[PDB]
Design an enzyme around this catalytic site. Sequence first.
Site, PDB file in Angstrom:
ATOM      1  CD  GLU A  35      -0.177  -6.331   1.358  1.00 57.96           C
ATOM      2  OE1 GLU A  35      -0.460  -5.313   0.841  1.00 57.96           O
ATOM      3  OE2 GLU A  35       0.124  -6.607   2.564  1.00 57.96           O
ATOM      4  CG  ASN A  46       4.005   2.222   2.495  1.00 60.25           C
ATOM      5  OD1 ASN A  46       3.778   1.372   3.341  1.00 60.25           O
ATOM      6  ND2 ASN A  46       4.126   1.821   0.884  1.00 60.25           N
ATOM      7  CG  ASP A  48       8.245   4.730   4.847  1.00 60.13           C
ATOM      8  OD1 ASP A  48       7.589   4.680   3.616  1.00 60.13           O
ATOM      9  OD2 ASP A  48       8.722   3.397   5.240  1.00 60.13           O
ATOM     10  CB  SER A  50       8.863   3.309   0.817  1.00 58.14           C
ATOM     11  OG  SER A  50       7.841   2.742   1.847  1.00 58.14           O
ATOM     12  CG  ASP A  52       3.460  -1.127   0.039  1.00 59.83           C
ATOM     13  OD1 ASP A  52       4.655  -0.891   0.362  1.00 59.83           O
ATOM     14  OD2 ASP A  52       2.554  -1.039   0.637  1.00 59.83           O
ATOM     15  CG  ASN A  59       8.024  -0.745   1.395  1.00 54.80           C
ATOM     16  OD1 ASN A  59       9.193  -0.570   2.106  1.00 54.80           O
ATOM     17  ND2 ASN A  59       7.232   0.081   1.573  1.00 54.80           N
ATOM     18  CG  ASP A 101      14.184 -10.326   6.299  1.00 54.30           C
ATOM     19  OD1 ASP A 101      15.470 -10.412   6.139  1.00 54.30           O
ATOM     20  OD2 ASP A 101      13.799  -9.648   7.039  1.00 54.30           O
TER      21      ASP A 101
END
Length: 129
Positions: A35, A46, A48, A50, A52, A59, A101
């Site tokens: 990562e 990202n 979209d 957003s 990270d 995110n 989650d």
Amino acid sequence: KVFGRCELAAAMKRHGLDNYRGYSLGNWVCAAKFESNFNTQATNRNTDGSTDYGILQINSRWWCNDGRTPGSRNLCNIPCSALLSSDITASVNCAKKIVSDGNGMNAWVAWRNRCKGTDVQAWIRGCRL
């Protein structure tokens, strides 16, 4: 801050990640390796819109606030900047929520594509823990 492999293992273990929700320590170090390459200050935009953040590339769409992701959440209740400190406490506490989650460490696409099913224990090879 760029952590050493075993140095990050020790910090992750001290924050209670070793076998958190069933994922041995080698999993989380492997996740961080690919990562961020153990760098707390890593950011990536990202598609979209957003961003990270940090060692585990968390995110802004669901997990932290950066003031620039329209229609997003802040479920970890943190400014995304907190994911970038040399103190990994905020990243760890927010990872625990993510891993809980419902999809496990599959939430991290890098873990699923690069760590899942591998010999992850190698990431803790030779560390005083």
